[PDB]
Amino acid sequence: VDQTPFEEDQTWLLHSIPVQQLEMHHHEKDLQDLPFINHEQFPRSLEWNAP
Amino acid sequence: YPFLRRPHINPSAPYFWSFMTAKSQMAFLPEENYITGDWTGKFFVSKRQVYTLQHATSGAKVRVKIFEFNSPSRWNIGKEMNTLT
Amino acid sequence: SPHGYIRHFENEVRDLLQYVDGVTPWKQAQKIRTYWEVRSHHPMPQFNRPEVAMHRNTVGLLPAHMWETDKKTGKVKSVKD
Amino acid sequence: RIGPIGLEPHQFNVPAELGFVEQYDNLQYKRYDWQGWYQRMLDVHNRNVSLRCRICDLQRLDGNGVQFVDMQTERRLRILAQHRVGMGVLKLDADKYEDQADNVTFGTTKLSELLADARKAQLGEEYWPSVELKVRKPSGQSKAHY
Amino acid sequence: LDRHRALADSLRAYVEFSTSKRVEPWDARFKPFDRIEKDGVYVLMRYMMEEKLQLCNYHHRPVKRLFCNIGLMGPQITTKARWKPYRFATNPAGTSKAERMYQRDKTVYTHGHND
Amino acid sequence: VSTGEFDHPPFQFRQRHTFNTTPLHDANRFGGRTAYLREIGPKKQGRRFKKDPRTVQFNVDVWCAQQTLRKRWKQRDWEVIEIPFRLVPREQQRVIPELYTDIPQMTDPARNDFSNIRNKVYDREELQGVLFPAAGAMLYPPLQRVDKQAMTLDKYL
Amino acid sequence: FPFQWKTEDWYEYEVAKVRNRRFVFENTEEDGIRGSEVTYKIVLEGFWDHHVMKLAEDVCMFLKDVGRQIVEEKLVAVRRLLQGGAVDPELLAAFNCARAGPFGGLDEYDKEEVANFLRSDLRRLEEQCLSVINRCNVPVPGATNIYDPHTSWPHVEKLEPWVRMAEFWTSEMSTAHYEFRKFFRVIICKLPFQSTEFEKRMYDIRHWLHRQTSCEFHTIYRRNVIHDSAVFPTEHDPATPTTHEHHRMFSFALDWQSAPVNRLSTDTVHEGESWDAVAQRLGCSVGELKDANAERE
Amino acid sequence: GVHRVGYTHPSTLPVPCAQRWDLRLARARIFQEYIEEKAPGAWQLEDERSM
Amino acid sequence: QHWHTKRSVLSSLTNGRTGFIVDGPTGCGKSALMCQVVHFARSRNIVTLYVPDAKVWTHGEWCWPSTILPGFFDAPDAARSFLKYFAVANRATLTSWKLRCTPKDLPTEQGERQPQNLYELCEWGHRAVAPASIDRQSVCVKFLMDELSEEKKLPVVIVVDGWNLFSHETHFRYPHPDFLRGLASFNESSTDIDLYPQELPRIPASRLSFVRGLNKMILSGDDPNKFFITCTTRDFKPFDGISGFPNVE
Amino acid sequence: KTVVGTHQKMLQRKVTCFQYNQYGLFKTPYYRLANVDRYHAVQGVAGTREWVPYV
Amino acid sequence: NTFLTSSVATPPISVIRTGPKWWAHPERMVRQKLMYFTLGVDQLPLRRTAVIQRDLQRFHMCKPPPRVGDSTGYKRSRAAQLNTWYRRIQYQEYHMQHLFTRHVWGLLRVYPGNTTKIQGKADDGYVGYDSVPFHRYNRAPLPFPARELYERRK
RNA sequence: AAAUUAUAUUAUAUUAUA
Ligand SMILES: Nc1nc2c(ncn2[C@@H]2O[C@H](COP(=O)(O)OP(=O)(O)OP(=O)(O)O)[C@@H](O)[C@H]2O)c(=O)[nH]1
Numbered sequence A: 001v002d003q004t005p006f007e008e009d010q011t012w013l014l015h016s017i018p019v020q021q022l023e024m025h026h027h028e029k030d031l032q033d034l035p036f037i038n039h040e041q042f043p044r045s046l047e048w049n050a051p
Numbered sequence B: 001y002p003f004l005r006r007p008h009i010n011p012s013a014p015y016f017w018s019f020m021t022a023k024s025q026m027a028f029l030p031e032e033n034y035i036t037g038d039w040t041g042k043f044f045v046s047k048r049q050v051y052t053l054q055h056a057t058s059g060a061k062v063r064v065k066i067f068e069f070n071s072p073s074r075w076n077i078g079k080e081m082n083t084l085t
Numbered sequence C: 001s002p003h004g005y006i007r008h009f010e011n012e013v014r015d016l017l018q019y020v021d022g023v024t025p026w027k028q029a030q031k032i033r034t035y036w037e038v039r040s041h042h043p044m045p046q047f048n049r050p051e052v053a054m055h056r057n058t059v060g061l062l063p064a065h066m067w068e069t070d071k072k073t074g075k076v077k078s079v080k081d
Numbered sequence D: 001r002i003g004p005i006g007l008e009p010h011q012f013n014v015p016a017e018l019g020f021v022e023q024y025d026n027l028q029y030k031r032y033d034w035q036g037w038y039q040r041m042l043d044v045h046n047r048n049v050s051l052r053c054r055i056c057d058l059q060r061l062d063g064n065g066v067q068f069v070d071m072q073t074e075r076r077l078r079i080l081a082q083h084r085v086g087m088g089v090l091k092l093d094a095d096k097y098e099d100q101a102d103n104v105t106f107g108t109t110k111l112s113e114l115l116a117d118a119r120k121a122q123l124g125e126e127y128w129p130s131v132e133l134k135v136r137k138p139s140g141q142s143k144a145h146y
Numbered sequence E: 001l002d003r004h005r006a007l008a009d010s011l012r013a014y015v016e017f018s019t020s021k022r023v024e025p026w027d028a029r030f031k032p033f034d035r036i037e038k039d040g041v042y043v044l045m046r047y048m049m050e051e052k053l054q055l056c057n058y059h060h061r062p063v064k065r066l067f068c069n070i071g072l073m074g075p076q077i078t079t080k081a082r083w084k085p086y087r088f089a090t091n092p093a094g095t096s097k098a099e100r101m102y103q104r105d106k107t108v109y110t111h112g113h114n115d
Numbered sequence F: 001v002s003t004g005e006f007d008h009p010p011f012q013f014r015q016r017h018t019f020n021t022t023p024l025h026d027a028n029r030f031g032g033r034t035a036y037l038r039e040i041g042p043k044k045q046g047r048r049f050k051k052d053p054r055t056v057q058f059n060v061d062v063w064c065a066q067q068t069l070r071k072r073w074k075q076r077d078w079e080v081i082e083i084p085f086r087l088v089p090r091e092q093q094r095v096i097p098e099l100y101t102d103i104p105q106m107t108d109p110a111r112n113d114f115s116n117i118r119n120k121v122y123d124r125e126e127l128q129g130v131l132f133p134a135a136g137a138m139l140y141p142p143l144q145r146v147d148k149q150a151m152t153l154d155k156y157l
Numbered sequence G: 001f002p003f004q005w006k007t008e009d010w011y012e013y014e015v016a017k018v019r020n021r022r023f024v025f026e027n028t029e030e031d032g033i034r035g036s037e038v039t040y041k042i043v044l045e046g047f048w049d050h051h052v053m054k055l056a057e058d059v060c061m062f063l064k065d066v067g068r069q070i071v072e073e074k075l076v077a078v079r080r081l082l083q084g085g086a087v088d089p090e091l092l093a094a095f096n097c098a099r100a101g102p103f104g105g106l107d108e109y110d111k112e113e114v115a116n117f118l119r120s121d122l123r124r125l126e127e128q129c130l131s132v133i134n135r136c137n138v139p140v141p142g143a144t145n146i147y148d149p150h151t152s153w154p155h156v157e158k159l160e161p162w163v164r165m166a167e168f169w170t171s172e173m174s175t176a177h178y179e180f181r182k183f184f185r186v187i188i189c190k191l192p193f194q195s196t197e198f199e200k201r202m203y204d205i206r207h208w209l210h211r212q213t214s215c216e217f218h219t220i221y222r223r224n225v226i227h228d229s230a231v232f233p234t235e236h237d238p239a240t241p242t243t244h245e246h247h248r249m250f251s252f253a254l255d256w257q258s259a260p261v262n263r264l265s266t267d268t269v270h271e272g273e274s275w276d277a278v279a280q281r282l283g284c285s286v287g288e289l290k291d292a293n294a295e296r297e
Numbered sequence H: 001g002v003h004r005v006g007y008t009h010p011s012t013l014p015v016p017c018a019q020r021w022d023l024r025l026a027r028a029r030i031f032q033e034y035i036e037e038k039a040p041g042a043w044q045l046e047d048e049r050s051m
Numbered sequence I: 001q002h003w004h005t006k007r008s009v010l011s012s013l014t015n016g017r018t019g020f021i022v023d024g025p026t027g028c029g030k031s032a033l034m035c036q037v038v039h040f041a042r043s044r045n046i047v048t049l050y051v052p053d054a055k056v057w058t059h060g061e062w063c064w065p066s067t068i069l070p071g072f073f074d075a076p077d078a079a080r081s082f083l084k085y086f087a088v089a090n091r092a093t094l095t096s097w098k099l100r101c102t103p104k105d106l107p108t109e110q111g112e113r114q115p116q117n118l119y120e121l122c123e124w125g126h127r128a129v130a131p132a133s134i135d136r137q138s139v140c141v142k143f144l145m146d147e148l149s150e151e152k153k154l155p156v157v158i159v160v161d162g163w164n165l166f167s168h169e170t171h172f173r174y175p176h177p178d179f180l181r182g183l184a185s186f187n188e189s190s191t192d193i194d195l196y197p198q199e200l201p202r203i204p205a206s207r208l209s210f211v212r213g214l215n216k217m218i219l220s221g222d223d224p225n226k227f228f229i230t231c232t233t234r235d236f237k238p239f240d241g242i243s244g245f246p247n248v249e
Numbered sequence J: 001k002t003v004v005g006t007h008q009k010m011l012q013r014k015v016t017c018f019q020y021n022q023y024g025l026f027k028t029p030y031y032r033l034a035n036v037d038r039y040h041a042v043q044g045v046a047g048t049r050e051w052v053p054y055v
Numbered sequence K: 001n002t003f004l005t006s007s008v009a010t011p012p013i014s015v016i017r018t019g020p021k022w023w024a025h026p027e028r029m030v031r032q033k034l035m036y037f038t039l040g041v042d043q044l045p046l047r048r049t050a051v052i053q054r055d056l057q058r059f060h061m062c063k064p065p066p067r068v069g070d071s072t073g074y075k076r077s078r079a080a081q082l083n084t085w086y087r088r089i090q091y092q093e094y095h096m097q098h099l100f101t102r103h104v105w106g107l108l109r110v111y112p113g114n115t116t117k118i119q120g121k122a123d124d125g126y127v128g129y130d131s132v133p134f135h136r137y138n139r140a141p142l143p144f145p146a147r148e149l150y151e152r153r154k
Numbered sequence L: 001a002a003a004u005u006a007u008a009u010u011a012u013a014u015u016a017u018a
């Protein structure tokens, strides 16, 4: 039993969905600390295409 | 300063089990509520040990870094030592 | 040697689970309890949170015999040990 | 062109590309007592092996005379490899092991497993993948009879 | 000795808050709730949603969820009609005063969840 | 192109309900979804997240994604039925690539049908022989299509 | 004209163009500068943009004279292979390997047809070795454009520099903005054959590079892959199918074996079994069973 | 709305064809894909800042 | 206006259909042409049905189930306004409209006359005290659509602004069955109407008694008398791939 | 599919007993002591202008 | 109206000093014209305000030339005479907007913000659901629920 | 007594009293 994505605004609003409270996490962007302590191991170019 | 990254880290009735406590009840007690290995005895226990039934039942010594818990009761059972002080 | 994510460690997870089941007795693993198993000894272990189902809290949920209340104000005036 | 060649009728020859990175330092980490772990870091960071194959190269005749990848085989390969197929080229980036030899072994194994799963469309029509049609709701002319 | 009875008193105040009846959380000034009690929404609350509103004790979240699930006047009701604020819908049934928001006991620590 | 609000207003002095100025947490903003994040007064874990910019920006991004999802799903007058390859019409007898795999494929450039196959929607009344072989009673009526060559009011007759 | 489109097609175009960035087949069997057999990319990095630009003139002139000498060594061999040669019996056995051909049954190629398939491939080597040699004789120092693939071999392709700025105090007084930066030129060498003599000469560029200027190497070569239909067979679905419960968390280690599955290549003959009865039980032909067991009569 | 997700075997259809769920199961067998049971169908939210 | 003489001409005009539907982009002369043809029809003394906005029926304030039609629904306020305004528009011909299939034992308060005309029927319907008008409009719309379907000699032009809202689902949804089932308490009754919202299947327009009578006149071929000169509306909100929140000012 | 029910709960209790028995297991997050300078003794804060991430 | 909070009053010179930002914003001035056009009312002080600020924004980037000196104060006083003339027409439209909007809000059964007067319904400043429990300047306690300025049946 | 240097914009503050 599953639910479809809603079509009205009041069902999205009144649904008990918690908000973000603590620090958010990403599974690959947690080695890099924050966008201000964006860590780079090697100085490869941002347009570097892997062969 | 970044959000909630300070290295040096309250009564509430509807948020009793959910404020400065574990999110789920399925999870087990932390590491300080159990004996890891061979110990000579600790001078004080950590602040994250959950007050269990045997804390108020036996009552040998409760030393929290100080703090002396000599008044045992059952309203503290299920809660860590942070909100008890 | 695998590298990166834990999904690439197939044999290492198997060897770790086999070693953990090998060294650990069951008479030690009985003593570890969950949070609700400790909270069951509290006089009021269960109540609804005010986010979803706050109206479903009933008057039978209180441990009213474990305290002494005031008759005029209605507040709790004493607690039982 | 290196690689083994299969002459048995149960061995198909796939001409495929392999992309990989070689990197050796020559300025500061050329030699000293750090040189070992820095070279290992450069090698394990360059552990990616990109194995690429055109689907048009897979549409040849096998050793038994039947075509290797037909239309329904191509559809099942496109559905089983969703984002790994792009612009008519099946590409697999093997990053699992630290060495590139074990990575190209794992990539060859995964390519053969994907090909063996996609070849099931030649067994029958019950392995042909279903076409997903966006069938409309009943129209207003049909809803007028409600 | 005082913290245990204070926590017990706060939990008792929270449960008696959860039990007692509230005022109507909708604003009677804004449409569709502005209409007379003999026509419109107050008809449909009288014959279909009467026991459902009487059982939930007129808290704003179950009343708004029952108005969402009743379907015969959504989805425009919970968005277009203005509702009373969170501290104003907190007030108990039959208040008829704005001082009653500040008349309640503040010694408990229910975070605004007492009568 | 859309002219709705996406970003959150920044943090500054406490605004007042004046001309060209709304308070930072108002019930008019974001459908009142700032009611979760507001403080009515003019515990640190419940007070610090209401003032963080990344937290409130992530929350309004989630709410705008919910609005985009409900408006994309309210557009749907169809549903996806898994139909076998034999009974499908001639435009779908080809190798259809996955989403974001190839160039957006035209339907039929030879038959002068230049449109995306992924946006094609087929009528239910034309597939009753495929979707309903077990009924045999023609559950949906045939679609009446107008005669384009008939002299009607549109052609001054 | 003018360009007006649906927004859903524009949303689908812009995601498909970025996800298919490196979905490219470099070594294709084709004409000039697009088509090749191996592709070498030498990514040079240095601290100054004129340092990498002057290095990319030093390496491209080096790989032009070396690469012309190697392709001339291959062109002098291809023109001997086109004058005449004897067909390899292992090459002839590779064409007559399939059971059924395109025309039904065994397609028996003779030494005329197999040498015809070898001649038509060596004619492509001459048209592709002359394409590299003619582009190695063009860049005179009077008129040199090493950034164009139609003009010079090898050509240099631009790459975006890596730039990373730092925001730090100069004291709470002021903020300084200094940026680390290094610049990149890549060199694309497309050869229509695999040469280890060139790969050896390409790897030793690292020993005479410029000051504080390093490099990394990319190699995209063609390699034959065998899909064995006996190690990885195409079989029916099982009677009891798999469900989502076989794909739980930690079902990658406790539910599934690694590919491939071990299938037994040895069996034991039972009591009343014959040559036609074992082959029925193993699902093979009787003559195919005796060929695997030619020791036992 | 709230519904139960259906499955039709190819032996039940008048014309048999490979479904998409067993193709998903085959893809999860090949690439060792974790299938989350408690993933709700209503929560399909794209990262619209990037997409 | 004289259809029985030019019946083959009107059949050739509509290509045998019951009427015309006018479509185009938004902001064209659709509703303006609907008011123009209502002017043309009522200036020539023809009985004219005018729904000036279909979004008061389908996208209305509230939905109520039909009193005498099982499984059908009603928009009560739009029906009261329609039964008022159509009666005061066509009083000239509705007073001469004799009731053919109408019961004469209608519920009637003290001092009120039983309706003998169709104008008297709509005056019985819309002129009432709340909440008796809520069921009086249902009975009046049912018997008005019944009385319309029997007249085969008087031409009745029916003009609807926004027929595309009468051809798909009205924005009301069906109520949750726990509302009608009955509850003792909320804690142990296996229900979630107070905990979580959910979207039930949406009510189509054919389940409204007004559009039921309209589709009954449309689909049944025994009515060569009703000319449906209607149009569509494209008044909907824009959506171009993304959507933030609408600024309220 | 192989390990379900009591075997899974017993295995979770046994791995919890194994996890708690490791004296000195590094469970500290990385950002708590990622602001250590090597040339001088001044302590900065990661996330502010008192620290640069590359050098 | 959905803005029911307590508000802060502003002097009319600070409103018109915003210019093209809020006061003579072209989207706002258009929907003020639709209010007057609906009532069958000529938009003459609004058209007077738009024609002034259309030309005022046209030269607002030019620098004024330095005046070397005049014997009498006549060209300086004429430039100040037209300057205070333009403020008084914009003061009239500032009153004409607040006059008609409070008159339309009494017709559409629209409840205004806190301490806002509607001439037909609430002669005093209407207050509903304020943070202060009493009336801020009438010194009267507020009842629960809020005061209804209109009848019930919509 | 002129030329204008003038920034200008809007908001906040305290043991009410614990
Ligand atoms: N007087 C008059 N006005 C017209 C005429 N044609 C168009 N208009 C104007 O065009 C505008 C559009 O009128 P509508 O018919 O309601 O627009 P629409 O095509 O229905 O647009 P949607 O409601 O979104 O479907 C009206 O406001 C009229 O002012 C006409 O023939 N006569």
Ligand SMILES: [Mg+2]
Binding pocket: I030, I031, I161, I232, I233, I234
């Ligand atoms: Mg219109």
